[PDB]
Prior knowledge:
Chain D: It comes from Mus musculus. By secondary structure, chain A is mostly loops.
Amino acid sequence: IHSIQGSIVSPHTAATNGGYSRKNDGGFFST
Amino acid sequence: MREIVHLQAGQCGNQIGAKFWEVISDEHGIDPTGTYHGDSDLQLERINVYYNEATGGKYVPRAVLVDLEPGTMDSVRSGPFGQIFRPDNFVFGQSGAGNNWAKGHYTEGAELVDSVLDVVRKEAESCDCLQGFQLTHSLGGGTGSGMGTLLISKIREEYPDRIMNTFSVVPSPKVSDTVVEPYNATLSVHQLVENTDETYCIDNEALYDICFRTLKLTTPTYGDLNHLVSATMSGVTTCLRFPGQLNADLRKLAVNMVPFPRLHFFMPGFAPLTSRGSQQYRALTVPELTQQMFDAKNMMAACDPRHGRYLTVAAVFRGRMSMKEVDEQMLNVQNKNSSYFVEWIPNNVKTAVCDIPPRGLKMSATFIGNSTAIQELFKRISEQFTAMFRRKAFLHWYTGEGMDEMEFTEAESNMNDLVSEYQQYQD
Amino acid sequence: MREIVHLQAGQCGNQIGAKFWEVISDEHGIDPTGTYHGDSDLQLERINVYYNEATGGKYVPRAVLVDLEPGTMDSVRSGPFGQIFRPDNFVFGQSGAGNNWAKGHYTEGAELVDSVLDVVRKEAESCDCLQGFQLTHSLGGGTGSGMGTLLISKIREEYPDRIMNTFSVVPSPKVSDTVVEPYNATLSVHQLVENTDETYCIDNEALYDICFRTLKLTTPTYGDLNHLVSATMSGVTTCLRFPGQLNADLRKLAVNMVPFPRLHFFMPGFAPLTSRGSQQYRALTVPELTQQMFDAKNMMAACDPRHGRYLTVAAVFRGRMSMKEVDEQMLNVQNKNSSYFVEWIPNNVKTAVCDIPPRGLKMSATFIGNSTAIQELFKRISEQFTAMFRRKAFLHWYTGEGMDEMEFTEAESNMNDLVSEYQQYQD
Amino acid sequence: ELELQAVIGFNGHVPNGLKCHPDQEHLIYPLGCTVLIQAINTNEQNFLHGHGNNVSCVTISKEGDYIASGQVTFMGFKADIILWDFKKRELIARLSLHKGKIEALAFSPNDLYLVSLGGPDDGSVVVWSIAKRDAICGSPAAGLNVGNATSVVFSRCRDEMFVTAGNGTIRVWELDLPNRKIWPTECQTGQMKRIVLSTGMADDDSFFYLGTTTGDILKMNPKTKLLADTGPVKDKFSLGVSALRCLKMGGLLVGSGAGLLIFCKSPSYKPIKKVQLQGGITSITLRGEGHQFFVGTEESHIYRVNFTDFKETLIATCHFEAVQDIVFPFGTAELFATCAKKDIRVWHTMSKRELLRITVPNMTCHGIDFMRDGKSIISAWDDGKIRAFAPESGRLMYTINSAHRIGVTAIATTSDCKRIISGGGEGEVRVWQVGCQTQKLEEALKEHKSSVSCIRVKKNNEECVTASTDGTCIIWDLVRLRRNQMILANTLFQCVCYHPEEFQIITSGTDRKIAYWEVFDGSVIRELEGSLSGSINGMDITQEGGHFVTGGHDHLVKVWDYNEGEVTHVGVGHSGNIMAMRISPGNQYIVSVSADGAILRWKYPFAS
Amino acid sequence: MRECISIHVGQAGVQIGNACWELYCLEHGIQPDGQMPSDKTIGGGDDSFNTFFSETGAGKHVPRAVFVDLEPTVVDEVRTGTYRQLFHPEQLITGKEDAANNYARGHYTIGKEIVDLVLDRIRKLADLCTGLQGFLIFHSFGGGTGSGFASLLMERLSVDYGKKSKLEFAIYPAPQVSTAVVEPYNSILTTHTTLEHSDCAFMVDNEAIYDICRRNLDIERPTYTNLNRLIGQIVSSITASLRFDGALNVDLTEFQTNLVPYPRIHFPLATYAPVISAEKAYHEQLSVAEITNACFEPANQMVKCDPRHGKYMACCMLYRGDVVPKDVNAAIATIKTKRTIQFVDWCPTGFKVGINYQPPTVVPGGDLAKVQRAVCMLSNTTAIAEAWARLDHKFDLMYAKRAFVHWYVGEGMEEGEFSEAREDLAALEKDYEEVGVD
Lengths: 31, 427, 427, 608, 438
Ligand SMILES: Nc1nc2c(ncn2[C@@H]2O[C@H](COP(=O)(O)OP(=O)(O)OP(=O)(O)O)[C@@H](O)[C@H]2O)c(=O)[nH]1
Ligand SMILES: Nc1nc2c(ncn2[C@@H]2O[C@H](COP(=O)(O)OP(=O)(O)OP(=O)(O)O)[C@@H](O)[C@H]2O)c(=O)[nH]1
Ligand SMILES: Nc1nc2c(ncn2[C@@H]2O[C@H](COP(=O)(O)OP(=O)(O)OP(=O)(O)O)[C@@H](O)[C@H]2O)c(=O)[nH]1
């Protein structure tokens, strides 16, 4: 279940990208 | 990103905040519990300016409500959106200040500032880069004024690089109910003029007037008044949260408004208000919209600047619109009364354009003026203060609290400074 | 392999270790009867940190409980997990403790040392290769102190090569109930500082503070207190038994913690503190988790370190983490208050990442700190000792026990030595 | 209203949920937000509904004329108790006074009044008068210094006495009729502090017993209100004693959470009869007098036992998890297969009879499909693997090992039975050649960058389309091995289906819409709103364009017309969010499967 | 013929190892059974694996490396993992105690009884290997256990076999991040113990790794998955020389010689230009000019030592894929004409180049692009010395107050070594300035 290394869940729905992270302050950053 | 944290001071602020917030939420289409129902992609994008996020699609907001009487806030909790409001933010006192601005200002606050500062610094570090924050209360609000003074005083040196909105409703000139209100008003404003940058002037009597004019529904609620003013504040905030051809920055708006540090006070003005037949008796055209906008009857914030003069004007329009109409309409008014403005700087206008319409109507606007329309108000406060301090009535309580009349002396000197500066700048 | 064997003394430790084992068994997924239900392969593998397999799929605790009054362990046996432990494991006394330090230190212990030494060496040979042992008791426990002194003293010359973890709880500063509690605490600590290496600090009053703040179910139990403190202790123990990118060794941590042999006492820092609505009102994220961790209210140990400065700090995150967020959060605290740390040595942060989350939650954390907040506590106890010995109150009991006055001299002298050393560094 | 014919499932997570009617002919249980009554012999099904949420608790009147039910709702909200007429199968009454949840219901012995136990935050008992449609009274159940109570039970000779128990709390009451008031009395238990799992009252009311959380048995005299005797001197049973049952003469039936079904006595509680079963025991009850009787597991297994020989019969079961997908053999409406956690199950439709099970150690499924010949079955596992199994033996033909690395979510096998098209969680789509002996990497297509949800291969065996968790769909050149065209939307595309002429494609992503897109050039055909609450997890379109079906979080299966584009039939009762649609060839039934593990063969309303 | 042995210490190194063997099994398409498919590859160990694995007639590849570990959890996990059948049981040398970050704990307490074991592993690899050109050391300066065992084993292999090569790789002290303050202690211990024997050390920093990651790889939350992916890609790029053939062939010995102007300093930096996301590669283009620009871009170095504060002495570039020497020398001539890049007067030439035809393929579960032209860059400059200045001013204050030294003196040392290391340092800096200056 947890002993898996394939990805890390973003705490928010990146579909909306609620935690808007910018491309080092330059654009989009989720996936 | 850049964000704002909301502040809810004084018992008026308590209700006005719940109203404003349900206005925001109903604009944003979330159910009261918080499980939103996707309709609006744009606000879906831009929600993070004003809400934070939880698990399972819940949009936890960012504000602090402060007061002393638990019943008011439990009534708020029983209000339609207590489930959206946070016990984390439910900070309060176990008593009352007796509406004694000084009791709050030195005694009661001394032990609640701790918790409120903890909460606000938690919020500040949780967020990354505020534009700043806004405050909602009454200048005549005893607890509101007392707490607001201290909190603004602290937060200035805390973060001196941020925006500090003050929405404070002005008590009725005709009746004050609370008669120590002139005391509290001058006391607060003495430090307010030093501290704040943007202040809103709002008057219950003028709200009653508009009720008689277009609302016309005989029996309104202070809640409906809250509806109106919350609509105004929503209008002034939407520019940040929305697309549209306009620089939304309230700092840019402020620097538009300020050649001078001492111009702190501002008179909001909203856009269409309607009767029950004029929905279908009114044709939505920008010309009549703006003609309605600039009206002494439309003037609701402080009073008619008719006897005064128009210093600076900033009009924002909301909904789809074209540049041509706004340009020509400003030329129209510029030339209709070029005399009625001030020659110091021509073209005292800045206009803003949000393309996104409101919900329930298509074309709307807001307008904020800083004109010569507060001389009446502070000259009134002057006569009241002078008459009071000929004999110093009710002052023994404030002595027992431990202050002195000398504070009142510098306050009245400060407001005389305000008198002279306003008058000398206008004439 | 490398394992630990536990010491449970003192009438508080009686409840504490019971809560401890029930918590760890809840973690490890075994029925109260001992027949393990295969759910977690890794914990099945690494149960040998604590438990020793018997016949028929049951693993015996490597814990030794000691006390003097039968009814204590009898109620323990009446507890839901008394069956887990052995009548082989139940060493005890044949008399009344009297809650007298010297009574527990000289007469009664003189003939139970043999039994306890035999049992502990029994378990020592039973296990193969050891890091050390941990003890659970109270410094305010008049029998836990009396027995722990002797047993630690003897195991010292037994094996000076292992890690001698100590977990004693502090009586209430506002009310000690036991009026000779200063006598007890001084007597214990004077040689405990000589002996031990690692020590934990807990204040019941601070626990009550926490309960008022966030628990809000009105009426807790000291059992609930045990639930929380056992949660913290279990969490700090989890490192060894679990995989993941963390160097679990308590020695790996202690070498980091101790630049100077005189440093022994350490305060905890825990992870989410939840209330009625915060569950659904909370998005479990590392940033806010770090914020909460470094918060005076969340620090639960003794009193406010706000008065002073931090020497060394060690954080462990449990669950699904990454190096980057924890590193940047350490940077964020470093930037926010480089002042509040010590110029003496930079970068006093020691970090661990346990991969296996606990049950009922996803993200958790623990923190152990060495800073200047015990100062008020021990200066309190010092002035208490002065005020009680000045007129030698309640002395005849200890005289008849066989004590004289001379030892108190170097007892309080060692206390003041520690006082002067701590202040000599931190200022 | 879309009409149902067959139902498969039971909420194996309700302690003491299964009930037996006094007729000795109706076996009754809650099914999510639906309540089901079952003919023991003729297996006819009877559903009632109207529940605002999934049903939590239930009880039958001694006459078996009245059914008390109660659901679980969200925090800060009231839950619903519904009284039902049995012979009428009709909603007598609804009440909503407690908040949070309701966990214990109780008919008075003479069916005079009702007892309801509210949620832990509610924490109150309330008695209601059937004669006059109102609560008699209520009170916070326990004293302030105790944990939460668990289960209530009336007396067996008085409607004015009853007991409840829980976290170290044990109380009995007296119904003070003239004052309409409650009188509590907590019991003494010496130093045994325990928490109750199961409760039972003596028919003669001489005593009453409880299985604790620790797997001990408590014997209790009510009149003295004194502890009588305890459980097994030694050898308690792991995972406590979840359920219980007394016997008319004496002796107790005990079910442990360890799936240990026993009968024992008292003076010794020594195990008289033992069988170990499959699924922690959640309910036990007696058919009339209990010479034959039934038990229900956490694994949602149903066993019928005659006490005489003490052997069991698993007579019903279902997937206890989120059934990730279902599929049918091609052209027929006689059987199908269902993926879920721990297993796959092939079932026969009209008998609802599980034809075959697959023991799958330590696994959750995501994707499945048949093969066209009725000889091979292909799967898609969250461990990044694939498997192939025989059609009527269910034996592992092959395990494609590390077929993916972040799991396998979306599967498809070609009608020609030669190629496998797969979309995964990393964003890959691999097509591979197959055989009975060897399977090798055709290629690992790498275009998507999140999880993939659904696949649809064109009947020409030349194109393919896929819905995934990034907002992108790709129609693909199966032959040239390159994207044909792209469909990006303000959604996270989850379910997709073609057009029979293949000139349209119908989709529902996360945008709560149904979309028709034209394959020719890339211009949208039509938009409509699909789910009034949530997304549409499954769609299925008629082979000839008459209709289609959409369903999901809205718990409504919605047959829409295709030549009209309008909601033609809606079916409800699905408590789990409805996960997948499957069309019986022959135009006979839809099979709707929901995340609760409810499988529903809804009958064909229109004409076939 | 052409092969090398690798050594891997500490739970620091264990996961990075396991990852890089995953990488090797990928590029060879190795199967977890232990044998290749129906393709004809098996022998006595003379093919693409001949340098890497040891596939005897049994058909089972045996990689040419050793893991020494002291913390059983990780080694048991990998023993329970996927490739344990590939892995010979006891070459996973496992210990039962941990060095508590103490270089000397790992250097005296447990090492003696384990270094003999490791030596036997060495000699039993030595008999079977033929060319064994050198040794690839995977350790860490912030070694909780990677420090002391690495030091003493290097001592023993230096004294026994001084004719061959040993190539060293650690994680460096972060300029500002410290998970330990025993870190300067043991880092400097290892450095000064290695100064007189260590051959050539190449250094990496996962801060800068993440910096590049969120710089262009779009991943806000990578892990050692990606970390080890990239560092193993670097070492794979350097060993492609052995694996395939190319336009020209270069060897570790030439790396040493042409990378040592003068002794003491053997601590250059690597930088890999063509790092990009899959989609950005999809809709952009790659060429030697911009990859050269990036590889000499100041932030693209995986160490935050400023090039425009430093002066360069040695530079080596190696490409994989399809290019022409015409444009290659064109780009290098443009760089020579460029004024920002500053070699010293002492060397007119400062470049050594290598080329391979083989394009490194893509890895399943990877994150990079689909490369057709790649380049790795190993260069030694003067800018690194600030990384030692920071350590020395960090170290002098704490040594002047004698913090945590009580542990070491109790478990059997003194401060004479700590003294020695300080002027060893001072010598290394002063030499760095004396060679940077003209
Ligand atoms: N919320 C609310 N406030 C009102 C209403 N009508 C008048 N007010 C005024 O709003 C003022 C602001 O309230 P607060 O800022 O909370 O004042 P305070 O510090 O609590 O002291 P008080 O002015 O005595 O209430 C009050 O002084 C009232 O005079 C109303 O209908 N609702
Ligand atoms: N177990 C338990 N201990 C408590 C509780 N409240 C306070 N304590 C304190 O924990 C202390 C430690 O107990 P012991 O070390 O066994 O004390 P002692 O030497 O046996 O004698 P006394 O401390 O005087 O009872 C006691 O002194 C109590 O004062 C509680 O609720 N439960
Ligand atoms: N090489 C490596 N370093 C890591 C890894 N994860 C974190 N690090 C950093 O590298 C350091 C690892 O060195 P050590 O902790 O001394 O490892 P060790 O010497 O084998 O002994 P331990 O204390 O048991 O780990 C840590 O301090 C981290 O800062 C990893 O997976 N591999």
